[PDB]
From a paper:
To improve the understanding of molecular interactions between xenon and transmembrane receptor targets, we investigated xenon binding with the Gloebacter violaceus [name] ([name]), a member of the pLGIC family, using X-ray crystallography under pressurized gas. Previously, the sensitivity of [name] to gaseous anesthetics has been studied using 2-electrode voltage clamping techniques and this revealed that [name] currents are inhibited by clinical concentrations of xenon.
Upon channel closure, the revolving motion of the M2-3 loop destabilises this network of interactions and Y197 predominantly adopts a downward conformation stabilized through hydrogen bonding with T255 (M3 helix). Indeed, the xenon-bound [name] LC structure reveals that the contraction of the intra-subunit cavity constrains xenon binding to one single location at the cavity entrance. Xenon binds to a novel site located in the pore, in (and only in) [name] LC form. This site is located in the middle of the channel pore, on the receptor five-fold symmetry axis, between the S230 and I233 rings of residues (respectively S6’ and I9’ in a prime notation that starts from the N-terminus of M2 helix). The inward movement of the M2 helices that occurs during the pore closure reduces the pore radius at position I233 (I9’) from 6 Å in [name] open to 4 Å in [name] LC and likely enables optimal hydrophobic interactions with xenon. The Xe atom is surrounded by the side chains of five Ile 233 (I9’) residues at a distance of 4.4 Å. In [name] open form, xenon binds between M1 and M2 helices from one subunit and M2 helix from the adjacent subunit in the inner part of the TMD while in [name] LC form, xenon binds between M1 helix from one subunit and M2 and M3 helices from the adjacent subunit in the outer part of the TMD. The location of a xenon atom in a functionally critical region of the pore could easily account for the inhibitory effect of xenon on [name].
Residue numbers in the entry:
A (entry chain C), B (entry chain D), C (entry chain E), D (entry chain B), E (entry chain A): 5 to 315
Write the structure that this text describes.
């Protein structure tokens, strides 16, 4: 078998569609997600056209090996998809209606700059390579693009599953390549983050601030340094232990600031004690009293600046 | 190798049955479970009907490739099941009795709101796509549905394995599809949850409450902050090792409350010391004495409120 | 490609034998072990009998597809075994000497109640489903049941590899199933557990007991609470790395008791200080002096009770 | 299904080309990277020659099984690549133009001496073994070598993808082997390393230096030892998760120096207290005052020496 | 498709050779290593012997299915090797020269008693089972046993790759089996171990010894107990990540001794304080002064004893 001949000079249009059956194993570290879906393909092959009267059948069923089928591949996959041809139906005019069920581990970059208030667009790129006899172009039938109502990703809200109707046609290794962009829009379920991460982290930092209502250097050293240990310990507890980000994230900036605040609070505690020991209790007491307001105010202000910069 | 013809216009009924041989690898983090079972299939194909007299046999055995077999797939699976046809038996009236042994990693959502006192319903969805010449409908042969007595999941009690006899017939990709729901009901058996996680976690919290029978600020700071470190450390030790659930769990609420209590106990310790240092020992001593009763009472009360809200 | 016919009414006997080549990847957490072995099968098919004179050969070699072979499966496996047919030999009377090399991940429950002084019996269940024309029954020749001298599992002593000669014949889905039990007896190598886990864990607990020879509340609080942190930290280090079992283990009871002892020692330290501060140094000194004997004695006694209950 | 015959005695030239579609899963610990690319092959097999006039077609398409294809293997791969033949085109002269899409996990050594300011050259070695009838030699078709613009490796800048045009022809097991070197040059994106790892690690070290403005031995012991705990804790948190490299890395030297500085600061704190207790407050105060300058200066100097030695 | 007949009664000699292409993924915890190599096989079959004058070919090339090939298996493998037949050549005398490229995960026990100053001998056991008509014996072709110069294992020095030329012939399942031992000798690259693990672990222990130049019980308790926490914390950081070995290792003994030393130092600190408080400052001061020498001397001596016992 060889590609169907053109009636004029027109390229062959392969009408696609992807219907999500299952979405699972979204890996934030690897920036990969596992998908189980239907892939529908539709094209016209007049060599396969028939008279339903002199055939006795209104539809003809074929085996994949029996007829010409376009070679559709995915661009952003780990390995080639595991596919199972479900059905191949031919109508009297030569229209081929192909359907397969596939599973694939798709590689899609994730932007964590706004984590855990981030939204992601997961991509699935369909591609077809043209042959010398004729050019092959992809198209989307949006009626055939959908997802099962029970499709889920834990900790995410699945907004929509759509495709960018206009394909990306370009030349590669002296042949035309037609590419389609299938997009799965998801938004993170950030609720439990406040009581599970933020609030306890904030409490530890607030504990370190009680050193501003104490003159005991030994009790102050225990307060700021032991809370720093508790902060690090807490971060180990809730750390995914999975992603080291090249870029600066929102949460990443807050955490860096918290470390800076532990260092500044140590400097204060050190300064206050030194001034007290160096017969200057008026300056020590005035710094400690200022810190009581300065620390929560500078924190609340810098957080507003960060929230503004990232969102 | 075409579907059996209808006697009238009726759809083909494929009688199903699943018998669990082994259940294993239930992953709470991935919301998946590995199953090893028998899949029985029964349908009538009159093209296969024979006279036991002029044949000499009461039953006929066929190879899968020799006869028409419906394409049964699972909806909620990672990849297609690993199947091995055990037996194919045809009776004189054309009744086919198919049996295969399969293994599959099933994706089933889990509700952790009541953990570790939670119960789960694991789902296995059978499906069949109808063909050009006739519609295929699934049915349940209750005689063929069951589980091996030795079937186990560590830390779980297997209540029952049943199927919702009425199939879910709907339209998918312009063809009728009949779906079945097989349910495995399991309840968490975690006898050791109390001694292993709860009690050591409560002991650490109770140690922090000894600061209410002490006036030493240095000893009190060491008590509340060091126990907070011990609490966090203990939670790293008994860590679920599962990514935090988006929703608020029962255990999650108790743990959040424990962090809040560590913060409140710090506030008390800070207030008591400040009042003492600011020549008000009557109000400091009255707060510390109230806390001795207030802390266990508010804890025991809030826990009853939480237990009521979740159960 | 039909089962051999009976001479009278008797069922077909398939003589089995498993010879362990390699045993590896014993996962305590998954309760699974990977095995690489030989599977020998012996049966008589009179349709295969021949005259060695006419044939010119004393033995005949066949391909698996050329002759009838019983469908032997394993009950407690993740997926069907990866098998490679090594040899098929037919003697002039129609006796078949089948041999294959296989690898399989076997699921076998493990009892950790006596850990690390536990012994386990690993099971491999062979099974055959009886066919339409005649019943198939399994048998063992214990001469053919063996293991390579170099077979090993790190941290275990392999006592024996045997089979329960009497098969378990039962009805399942209206047919007979003949099941065989192959047992691998292993006993844990518990020596490094004393210097690596037990002894350092006891030293940490003993350090907390030095608070009974001190009147300094600040030093005592640091002793009991810092050792509790060290205990938890040590447990994180020597993590069994297995999720807590549902049942109460021997080691599990000892560890729970150690947490209880840290709580009791805190109560003592708190009581001592309170009586000392509340003008009662006679009681505080008598309690502390009693604790010096009470704590090691109650510990040593409760440990004897636990060791008695578990063993 | 035999190699093409030589016209004289010349070796067969197989023109190669690799075009990267996707690059992912670069494992620093395993020294491996997963690649998804096109592999183009071109050679002359005159036995496949045809007249485009008699055939009608200007190019002929073949199935891989229909014609002879050179056995190209990769030297540094875990297992043989997962390949999918995209196209096989034969021109009238008998020139074959082969194209396949493959995925492979490539093993390439990584030098971490300059981490996180390191650059790496990832290698892909193509190889062909010569046959009985004729020698096979590899060549590079530069028109067919490249990478997709969207190719990315999280935390890396992809500089270039090139091939060393001159093959390495050598004898192995009495036959000629022609080897090609495909190189992917990458450089690490080290920015978030400063605020995420370096800066919080420096703050903990600086906190330990506040002991040089304190005479309280109890407060000093708490400062240096508690910060050492915080340092270790922080290292557990931002752990590379890679086993210690056999060689001494840049970051490895800095961390070793930080441990040495914690030990030296302890020695100082111990010396200062001993001199004070042994009626020598002039010597104690002069050491502590010197340390205030000595510690940051020696640190800043040794860091310059290390940066010079490694870069 | 029957073994070659013997000229007399001699067994068939299969000359073997393994050439390492790649060595990777050496897992200490799993005691496995992944290998990628060539397997050469040579044997004489006179049924394939031909006259070169009337045939006119250097060597005849065959497909695996076309001729008899001995079934060579590996003893110590997880699953059967992934093999790709590279070449099959037959010379006029009937000498078959077989070559395949394979990948396999080999199970080889590792002795960690001398870690990290250990050397290992990795084993690859070739095996052949004799057949009905004749016995098969393995031999080593030393010209075909080697390794690629670029073969590497991170953290190891690859000394040599050799084979024990004399096979181990024994009876198994009533047939003769000829076994060959291929050995890969490797020695660990222990340099970064001193600055990364040993030296910071000794510094933490040395810090605990500063308690011998202090009379402050509160400062001493903080010294010994906080360093014990730092030691455990450090061990978590540079954790082997391998499950505890059943046997006592060199490093294991040193670490056990370090825990014993922390306990002894606590006893001293406790004894010194008790003697001081129980009006015996002469006895207390003499113990603390002795400990200053006793602790480093006993440590240095016991370490020499351990180093002597293990090496
Ligand atoms: Cl694909
Ligand atoms: Cl399926
Ligand atoms: Cl099986
Ligand atoms: Cl390859
Ligand atoms: Cl093998
Ligand atoms: Na086709
Ligand atoms: Na069929
Ligand atoms: Na057969
Ligand atoms: Na070929
Ligand atoms: Na053969
Ligand atoms: Xe998607
Ligand atoms: Xe955060
Ligand atoms: Xe601040
Ligand atoms: Xe189920
Ligand atoms: Xe909890
Ligand atoms: Xe907190
Ligand atoms: Xe409270
Ligand atoms: Xe077993
Ligand atoms: Xe210890
Ligand atoms: Xe224990
Ligand atoms: Xe506790
Ligand atoms: Xe006790
Ligand atoms: Xe590369
Ligand atoms: Xe910090
Ligand atoms: Xe660093
Ligand atoms: Xe210094
Ligand atoms: Xe090896
Ligand atoms: Xe240190
Ligand atoms: Xe700590
Ligand atoms: Xe060590
Ligand atoms: Xe000692």
């Amino acid at each position: 078998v060889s590609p169907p001949p053109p009636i004029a000079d027109e390229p062959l249009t392969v009408n696609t569609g992807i219907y999500l059956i299952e979405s699972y194993s979204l890996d934030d570290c690897a920036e990969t997600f596992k998908v189980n879906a239907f892939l529908s393909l539709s094209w016209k092959d007049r060599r396969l056209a028939f008279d339903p009267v002199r055939s006795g059948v209104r539809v003809k069923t074929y085996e994949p090996e029996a007829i010409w089928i376009p070679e559709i591949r995915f661009v952003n996959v780990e390995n080639a998809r595991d596919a199972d041809v479900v059905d191949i139906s031919v109508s009297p005019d030569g229209t081929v209606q192909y359907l397969e069920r596939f599973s694939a581990r798709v590689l899609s970059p994730l932007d964590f700059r706004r984590y855990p208030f981030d939204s992601q667009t997961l991509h699935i790129y369909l591609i077809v390579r043209s042959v010398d006899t004729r050019n092959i172009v992809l198209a989307v039938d949006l009626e055939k693009v959908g997802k099962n109502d029970d499709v889920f990703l834990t900790g995410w809200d699945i907004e929509s599953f759509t495709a960018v109707v206009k394909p990306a046609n370009f030349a590669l290794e002296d042949r035309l390549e037609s590419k389609l962009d299938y997009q799965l829009r998801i938004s993170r379920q950030y609720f439990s983050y406040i009581p599970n991460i933020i609030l306890p982290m904030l409490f530890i930092l607030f504990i370190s601030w009680t050193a501003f209502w104490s003159t005991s250097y030994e009790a102050n050293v225990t307060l700021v340094v032991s809370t720093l240990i508790a902060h690090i310990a807490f971060n180990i507890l809730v750390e995914t232990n999975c992603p080291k980000t090249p870029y600066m994230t929102y949460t990443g900036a807050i955490i860096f600031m918290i470390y800076l605040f532990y260092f500044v609070a140590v400097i204060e505690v050190t300064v206050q004690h030194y001034l007290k020991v160096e017969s200057q209790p008026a300056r020590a007491a005035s710094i400690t009293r200022a810190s009581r307001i300065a620390f929560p105010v500078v924190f609340l202000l810098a957080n507003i600046i960060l929230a503004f910069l990232f969102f």
